[PDB]
Write an enzyme that holds these catalytic residues in place. Structure first.
Site, short mmCIF file in Angstrom:
data_model
loop_
_atom_site.label_atom_id
_atom_site.label_comp_id
_atom_site.label_asym_id
_atom_site.label_seq_id
_atom_site.Cartn_x
_atom_site.Cartn_y
_atom_site.Cartn_z
N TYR A 196 0.83 -1.16 0.00
CA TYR A 196 0.00 0.00 0.00
C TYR A 196 0.89 1.24 0.00
O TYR A 196 0.54 2.21 -0.65
CB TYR A 196 -0.95 -0.04 1.20
CG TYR A 196 -2.12 0.89 1.09
CD1 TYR A 196 -3.09 0.71 0.11
CD2 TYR A 196 -2.29 1.90 2.02
CE1 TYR A 196 -4.20 1.47 0.09
CE2 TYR A 196 -3.43 2.72 1.98
CZ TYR A 196 -4.39 2.49 1.05
OH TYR A 196 -5.50 3.33 1.00
N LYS A 239 -2.93 8.33 3.31
CA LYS A 239 -4.09 8.11 4.21
C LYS A 239 -3.78 8.53 5.65
O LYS A 239 -4.68 8.98 6.34
CB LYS A 239 -4.56 6.67 4.24
CG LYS A 239 -5.22 6.12 2.96
CD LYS A 239 -6.32 6.99 2.37
CE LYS A 239 -6.94 6.37 1.14
NZ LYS A 239 -8.13 7.13 0.64
N1 NAP Z 1 -11.58 -0.44 -2.50
C1 NAP Z 1 -11.05 -0.47 -1.30
O1 NAP Z 1 -10.63 -1.68 -0.76
C2 NAP Z 1 -10.87 0.74 -0.43
C3 NAP Z 1 -10.62 0.53 0.93
C4 NAP Z 1 -10.51 1.63 1.77
C5 NAP Z 1 -10.64 2.91 1.25
N2 NAP Z 1 -10.84 3.07 -0.10
C6 NAP Z 1 -10.95 4.43 -0.64
O2 NAP Z 1 -12.22 4.68 -1.20
C7 NAP Z 1 -12.15 5.80 -2.06
C8 NAP Z 1 -12.91 5.37 -3.31
O3 NAP Z 1 -12.18 4.40 -4.03
P1 NAP Z 1 -12.83 3.10 -4.68
O4 NAP Z 1 -12.17 1.85 -4.23
O5 NAP Z 1 -14.31 3.29 -4.58
O6 NAP Z 1 -12.39 3.21 -6.20
P2 NAP Z 1 -12.91 3.93 -7.54
O7 NAP Z 1 -14.25 3.39 -7.86
O8 NAP Z 1 -11.72 3.66 -8.40
O9 NAP Z 1 -13.02 5.44 -7.03
C9 NAP Z 1 -11.91 6.32 -7.03
C10 NAP Z 1 -12.44 7.69 -7.47
O10 NAP Z 1 -11.48 8.72 -7.32
C11 NAP Z 1 -11.71 9.63 -8.38
N3 NAP Z 1 -10.54 10.47 -8.67
C12 NAP Z 1 -9.23 10.10 -8.74
N4 NAP Z 1 -8.51 11.22 -8.93
C13 NAP Z 1 -9.34 12.29 -8.96
C14 NAP Z 1 -9.12 13.65 -9.13
N5 NAP Z 1 -7.87 14.12 -9.33
N6 NAP Z 1 -10.20 14.50 -9.03
C15 NAP Z 1 -11.50 14.02 -8.88
N7 NAP Z 1 -11.70 12.67 -8.71
C16 NAP Z 1 -10.63 11.84 -8.75
C17 NAP Z 1 -11.97 8.77 -9.57
O11 NAP Z 1 -12.59 9.55 -10.56
P3 NAP Z 1 -12.26 9.32 -12.12
O12 NAP Z 1 -12.21 7.84 -12.43
O13 NAP Z 1 -13.37 10.00 -12.87
O14 NAP Z 1 -10.86 9.81 -12.44
C18 NAP Z 1 -12.81 7.68 -8.95
O15 NAP Z 1 -14.18 7.99 -9.04
C19 NAP Z 1 -10.66 6.05 -2.20
O16 NAP Z 1 -10.22 7.01 -1.26
C20 NAP Z 1 -9.96 4.79 -1.73
O17 NAP Z 1 -8.68 5.11 -1.21
C21 NAP Z 1 -11.01 2.01 -0.94
O1 CH8 Z 2 -7.41 2.85 -0.61
C1 CH8 Z 2 -7.68 1.63 -1.10
C2 CH8 Z 2 -7.42 0.51 -0.33
C3 CH8 Z 2 -7.63 -0.75 -0.87
CL1 CH8 Z 2 -7.32 -2.14 0.09
C4 CH8 Z 2 -8.03 -0.89 -2.18
C5 CH8 Z 2 -8.25 0.23 -2.95
C6 CH8 Z 2 -8.07 1.50 -2.42
O2 CH8 Z 2 -8.28 2.61 -3.20
C7 CH8 Z 2 -7.20 3.16 -3.85
C8 CH8 Z 2 -5.95 2.57 -3.79
C9 CH8 Z 2 -4.85 3.15 -4.42
C10 CH8 Z 2 -5.00 4.32 -5.17
C11 CH8 Z 2 -6.27 4.90 -5.25
C12 CH8 Z 2 -7.36 4.34 -4.58
#
Ligand code: NAP
Ligand code: CH8
Ligand code: NAP
Ligand code: NAP
Ligand code: NAP
Ligand code: CH8
Ligand code: CH8
Ligand code: CH8
Ligand code: GLU
Ligand code: GLU
Ligand code: GLU
Lengths: 254, 254, 255, 255
Positions: free
Chosen positions: C156, C163
């Site tokens: 990560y 974060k």
């Molecule tokens: N998936 C996980 O396991 C996980 C776990 C914990 C936390 N999170 C967090 O959850 C949040 C959402 O991520 P996700 O997993 O739902 O993935 P996602 O569907 O890939 O969402 C990420 C979003 O960030 C947007 N983005 C990136 N750069 C940007 C910018 N410069 N300005 C405006 N928007 C921007 C993208 O928009 P565009 O595609 O339109 O560029 C996309 O909609 C993130 O903070 C990630 O770190 C995810």
């Molecule tokens: O923050 C995240 C954590 C996990 Cl486990 C999976 C996806 C996640 O979302 C992002 C991870 C890296 C870059 C941008 C978003």
């Protein structure tokens, strides 16, 4: 260097004890040591291990921390024999084997309260009595485990008693701080000791460290003792109420 | 005893820098030291500070941590002149002054990224370059403040930069642990220094430690230096990814 | 929870697996009016069709790249003219280059480290400054984090540092905005299969460890993150600010 | 939320100021059936006056002193025969002597220390064990803690070590009972003027430090704790376990 310094080390059972790690290090740095024990067998082990040390005098006191009268009279006697001391290494805990494996939700009241009594309260009463021999200040260190900060499998009743101990250290630090007495905890990684045999799945814990912890190796008793030396000495004067992990970095990862 | 140890200390500005507190402790202990500075004004200063140490040589290098090439060539020159090192004390942070007072919600992107860059990223690049001079391993210590763990009046952008740094330590510990390079932070109590004049409300922070912290007093640059000697030496060999509070117990109370 | 009469800005939907889309379905189910911001046109197209799934009478969609002060400033100022004052903001935006989400943290580039901070941490600050203009009577901002910001997690890397920065940002924002009655909080989501997770190395191993070791012995999903969001964005969490609620099957509590 | 058809056991109402009575007003307003447990006869008497502001058509009141296994064991068994299966437990019980609370921590007596552990920590483990029998299909257990468990605060003394213990108990219970779909969480409430608070030295200056320093610059009340408890006791918080939620105006997040 810890010449002209005197420390009470509580809770050596035998050569693997974490407290004997502490003893080897403080003895090498020139301290005078006093030892406390519960079991007759531990006095015997203590008389044998003293030949490895450079202490010219064996100072051995029986103190069962379940007894007020024993802690009070023990320290009172230490004070009569060696004078004022500079700190206390507390290396003492107990729980019934059946409370270190299986379901936590089934811990008995007497089991929970025995763990608390020996493993956490003992530090409050020890600090209260040891403070009488530290009129000019000093240092008190207690041994805890990562299971006091997070639920680990099998550690059960001892985790709740470590959580209690680690807070006891912070309340003592606040209380005793204006008396110039510092109180801290060393959170040691897993080490093969007599007590470790009561932790279900100990071997699994050991290897998880080797595999995942930053340093990719387990720590030993002497490493805990080198951190104890820092905490007990003037090297750490600004430091109180702290929990230092001697665990190869394991606490910092997930 | 740090004879035949070599440490690089980064971030001495004047007699009141925390890092000159570190310099002093390590010097007393027999360490050969190498120093890095940002601007000449700290160089001339620096050169006169060293006649208070017993370094027979003034090993001095200009490194602005905002430039990769200066960090790269700087560590490269250090290795050519003094061979392998035993560790690095990082004592470097910066923010624009208007971001260290008033409302955090009004921080500019420029000022935010500038604090991150100098105060946090610089440990990553320094770690990567330092490592090339620690083939048998070694120890890296950075300096942080309670502001990274809690929101604190005024400290604002530097608190998000310290939070970043404290996570940087952890991630460096995991990464470099297999090379036997330990990475830790010292979290210092408030201390009157050149940088501390930029922090809104700084005198109020000083006074509050005295009233409220367990030891009822402020820490100094040498108490930081003492704990840095622990972290940088073999006493702390099983300790990494750790944050040690040298702040009179303040972290431990509320 | 009744969110009739309330309006939320949800930032960071790219597709149906987005965590923000989970948030969007719950708030929508709860009566709330929703406004959406996207960076990529491809994301706006996903919003256009994902909106047929929702009960929103009309589509409020704004291109906001959080790298741009102008775009954040004018997007919220626009939002304020179209829907008026808002009740809070769900922030669900992060980015890091792929090189920086595997291998050795110690090799991270400056440009890659400041990129991750800029997008994933600073954006919250400016989004709050501009969003506050539309919450004259108070409100609630929630950002999305990961346990990787509190512990060093393999791979990560540059994100866990971003974060940590994000989580400090929520606290410092909380302290600054509290007198204005604007609450600021973080949800720490467990691993969820999203487009961004595709760039985090060993992701599949992350999901499997949760299932084997976390208290609940299962993974969470986007809708579960949405439910905690609904709590955090509503009056049920009055009194709660500067907080990081972990929605992760309990994983944060065990070692 | 939405809680009709849910039944919750609420432990620790003494009077109208109890934190538990705030929990109970929120749950009752949400449609839940409530079962109350009390220790002192005077508490029962207050419960009977207070049920009258409640929409409870039946007083379900059970005497349980959590010092006695047989009382917790029999009371829950009786609860089972009277309301059947239950959805969760709100635990709002603590106790410590004035004689240890208002002398130096280092002078705490063995019996006082162990009294506070027994009533204020162990009571959760045994309650959880007996409650689980009534949660065949899962459930939620919430206990009440205080920032004093995480930091040494002046005067709180023996109760902060008991809260530290309570907070580990939550985690260890969440880990053990998670496979049974039973979630265990804590609320860290801010200071609230209650009968028990009269036992905490310097309580009034604690209230005042919250108004002066907490992000929200006000204190919280019992109803706010109740709102976070409804979130925790309901399917809103699925995926949340082993968690400590601070309802304290954000005072936990600042230094
Ligand atoms: N998936 C996980 O396991 C996980 C776990 C914990 C936390 N999170 C967090 O959850 C949040 C959402 O991520 P996700 O997993 O739902 O993935 P996602 O569907 O890939 O969402 C990420 C979003 O960030 C947007 N983005 C990136 N750069 C940007 C910018 N410069 N300005 C405006 N928007 C921007 C993208 O928009 P565009 O595609 O339109 O560029 C996309 O909609 C993130 O903070 C990630 O770190 C995810
Ligand atoms: O923050 C995240 C954590 C996990 Cl486990 C999976 C996806 C996640 O979302 C992002 C991870 C890296 C870059 C941008 C978003
Ligand atoms: N081994 C590990 O991996 C590990 C890791 C982290 C923390 N710790 C902690 O380190 C400390 C020492 O344990 P250890 O592992 O070194 O095992 P140990 O050698 O078994 O030492 C435990 C000691 O506690 C003493 N003790 C137990 N009850 C006592 C009582 N009522 N009064 C006085 N002394 C009593 C025992 O004395 P008697 O034999 O005379 O009864 C024994 O000397 C413990 O606090 C343990 O929790 C150990
Ligand atoms: N003093 C405290 O109460 C306190 C408390 C906790 C933590 N800390 C931390 O302690 C560390 C040292 O600060 P201090 O209080 O000792 O103040 P200081 O004496 O002003 O030292 C700060 C140093 O940072 C250097 N620096 C800034 N930007 C740099 C750059 N781009 N490249 C190279 N060097 C750079 C400065 O060099 P130049 O002057 O040459 O520009 C200066 O030597 C900082 O990380 C600080 O945040 C301080
Ligand atoms: N008020 C605050 O500032 C505050 C802040 C944070 C946390 N808390 C926590 O909130 C919880 C509720 O306290 P409160 O402030 O609401 O005080 P409260 O109104 O006095 O409630 C405390 C309850 O504990 C019960 N209790 C004590 N010993 C018991 C036993 N052996 N068996 C069964 N019940 C027993 C009492 O019942 P009886 O009267 O029948 O004896 C009373 O109902 C406690 O855990 C407290 O530590 C309070
Ligand atoms: O606290 C301990 C942790 C580990 Cl990992 C191994 C041994 C430990 O020491 C004891 C474990 C249970 C009971 C008493 C002492
Ligand atoms: O990090 C610091 C904390 C305190 Cl309390 C005082 C001085 C500190 O050092 C700096 C503070 C702000 C910007 C650069 C360095
Ligand atoms: O745990 C409490 C915290 C505060 Cl600030 C006020 C009251 C509290 O509740 C009790 C405090 C002492 C003993 C029993 C309960
Ligand atoms: N004593 C452990 C054995 C397992 C191990 O150490 O790996 C148990 O009985 O669970
Ligand atoms: N994403 C992984 C592939 C396997 C996995 O997700 O565990 C990687 O690129 O390293
Ligand atoms: N409760 C305090 C009195 C004043 C206060 O609450 O500040 C005491 O009896 O010690």
């Amino acid at each position: 260097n810890l010449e002209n310094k005197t420390y009470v080390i509580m809770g050596i059972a035998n050569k693997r004890s974490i407290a004997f790690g502490v003893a080897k290090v403080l003895d090498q740095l020139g301290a005078k040591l006093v030892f406390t024990y519960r079991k007759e067998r531990s006095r015997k082990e203590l008389e044998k291990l003293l030949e490895q040390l450079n202490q010219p005098e064996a100072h051995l006191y029986q103190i069962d921390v379940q007894s007020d009268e024993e802690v009070i009279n023990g320290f009172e006697q230490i004070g009569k024999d060696v004078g004022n001391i500079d700190g206390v290494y507390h290396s003492i805990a107990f729980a019934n084997m059946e409370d270190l494996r299986g379901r936590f939700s089934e811990t008995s009241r007497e089991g929970f309260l025995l763990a608390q009594d020996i493993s956490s309260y003992s530090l409050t009463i020890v600090a209260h009595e040891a403070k009488k021999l530290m009129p000019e200040g000093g240092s008190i260190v207690a041994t805890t485990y990562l299971g006091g900060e997070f639920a680990v499998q099998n550690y059960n009743v001892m985790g709740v008693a470590k959580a209690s101990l680690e807070a006891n250290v912070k309340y003592l630090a606040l209380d005793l701080g204006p008396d110039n007495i510092r109180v801290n905890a060393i959170s040691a990684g897993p080490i093969r000791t007599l007590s470790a045999k009561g932790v279900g799945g100990f071997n699994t814990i050991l290897k998880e460290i080797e595999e995942r912890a930053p340093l990719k190796r387990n720590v030993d008793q002497v490493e805990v003792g080198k951190t104890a030396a820092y905490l007990l000495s003037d090297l750490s004067s600004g430091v109180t109420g702290e929990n230092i992990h001697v665990d190869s970095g394991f606490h910092a990862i997930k």
